[PDB]
């Protein structure tokens, strides 16, 4: 039930421990320790900025309007959520995360403009 | 299509590149470099805090309930969005941004209290 305890569990089980890991992301001699702390903050903020760009700010589970390409993975839901742990899944689609991230950004950019014109 | 590429374009064109600039805001000898990095983070967080205060957290385009005073600028939409680049616009209303920011804060404070009493 602690940090990374679910690392060996199935994706559908591990997805219930997202707050366990989220809370462990934040907290001349002594300078390299400041560099490590500053860097940890910068890393954290980049992931948070990215979620904001995709329209997922403030949440751990975020649904989008980006469809899945089976060229990315053609496994079904029982193969992915009831087997392939998150470590296994990450390896399998590592080659596609930049394509997916680009498509999440493009979608949010269309959504924010369509919503401003409906408030007009 | 890169960072600040749209700086010379019209406001209505440049507004479509907001993620290009947002992503370039984050990333004894060596101390002044830590000071620069810490300062960059602090600057970033103040702008993000301010958007949160105004009720614009998590978005690049945010509509508000604050009306425009033509004492701030009496130009129409074709003058502003189809000419005056953002650099030109920023110069023209620089004298009024603190008045506008104060009015955005006051509005959000009334909105959050009206919404808590409707959930009661």
């Amino acid at each position, epitope marked *: 039930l602690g940090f990374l305890g679910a690392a060996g569990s199935t994706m559908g089980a591990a997805s219930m421990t997202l707050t366990v890991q989220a809370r462990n992301l934040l907290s001349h001699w002594g300078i390299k320790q400041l560099q490590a702390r500053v860097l940890a903050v910068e890393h954290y903020l980049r992931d948070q900025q990215l979620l904001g760009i995709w329209g997922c700010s403030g949440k751990l589970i975020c649904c989008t309007n980006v469809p899945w390409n089976s060229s990315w993975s053609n496994r079904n839901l029982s193969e992915i959520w009831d087997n392939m742990t998150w470590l296994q899944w990450d390896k399998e689609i590592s080659n596609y995360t930049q394509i997916i991230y680009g498509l999440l950004e493009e979608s949010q950019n*269309q959504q924010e*403009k*369509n919503e*401003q*014109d*409906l*408030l*007009a | 299509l890169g960072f600040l590429g749209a700086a010379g374009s019209t*406001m*209505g064109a440049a*507004s479509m590149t907001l993620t290009v600039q947002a992503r370039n805001l984050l990333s004894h000898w060596g101390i002044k470099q830590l000071q620069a990095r810490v300062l960059a983070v602090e600057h970033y967080l103040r702008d993000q805090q301010l958007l949160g205060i105004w009720g614009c957290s998590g978005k690049l385009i945010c509509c508000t309930n604050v009306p425009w005073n033509s004492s701030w600028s009496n130009r*129409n*939409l*074709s003058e502003i*969005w189809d000419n005056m680049t953002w650099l030109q616009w920023d110069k023209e209303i620089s004298n009024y941004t603190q008045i506008i920011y104060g009015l955005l804060e006051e509005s959000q404070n009334q909105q959050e209290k009206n919404e808590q009493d409707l959930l009661a």
Partner: antibody
Amino acid sequence: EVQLVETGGGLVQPGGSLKLSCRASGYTFSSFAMSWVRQAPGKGLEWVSLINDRGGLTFYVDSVKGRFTISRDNSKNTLSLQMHSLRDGDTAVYYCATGGMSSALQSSKYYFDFWGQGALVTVS
Amino acid sequence: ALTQPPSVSGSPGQSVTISCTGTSSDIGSYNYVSWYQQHPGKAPKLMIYDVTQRPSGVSDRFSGSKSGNTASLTISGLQADDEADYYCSAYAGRQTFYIFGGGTRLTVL
């Protein structure tokens, strides 16, 4: 000079389908919202559908809401309407018109600036 | 949806008024009333928009106005060539975007 030319269909059986299309020239197509306005042979004008200049937002009159699709192609300057289930009550002249909406950073419309001549759609 | 009279008429040189009465969540809520001129056999032409404005390309003999839930089109120096079906329309919200009246068959005597 702005021209909107309907190049759609004619006679269709009840319960069938018919697609209309309209070619635009003389203006920047992509700068304007467009709509379809219908006129039954013995009646006045009725608004049927509206589409955004970027093609993302569509609106319909309730009477065709689950039956008609309005679309747009900004590369080919083409407006189109796909009609399904075609009731006898859908017989009318269908006009291609420019207007009905703006994009927030533009002055508003809420009126129709340009009209085509209209395709006659007959359901028998 | 909107009510406007049939058969408005008058002789050349006389003015005529074509009325358009709607409802509160219509003409009474938004100042977006437009008028169109349709000669039989032709597509409608825009004459008036935003209650009082006219597009470039039309004469100043055509002037719009409104009060309460009623809008109207005034034609001043009436000409024989003004015979047409005049229609009013209005923006009526984001649920029922546009509504129209029936046509007014303006006849010049």
